[PDB]
Amino acid sequence: TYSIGQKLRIRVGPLKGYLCRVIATVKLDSQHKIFTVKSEHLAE
């Protein structure tokens, strides 16, 4: 699948197109929310 520290994109959702970084469970580049989503909802 993926690896720690990758930069992925939130494909579908209220938060779409946001870029985020995968702490372990992604974290957004400039906001404090730690969301967790499955692989289908994440893109390079």
Partner 1 sequence: TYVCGDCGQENTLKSGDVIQCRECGYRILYKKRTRRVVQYEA
**CA atoms of 3 and 14, how far apart (whole Å):** 24
Choose which of 2, 13, 16, 19 interacts with partner 1 (CB under 8 A). 19
CB of 23 to partner 1, least distance (A): 17
CB of 29 to partner 1, least distance (A): 5
Which residues, numbered 23-42, are part of the site for partner 1 (CB under 8 A)?
29-31
E-strand ranges in 1-44 read 8-10, 19-20, 26-27, 34-35, 42-43
10 alpha-carbon distance from chain centroid: 5
The footprint of partner 1 (CB under 8 A) covers 18-19, 29-31
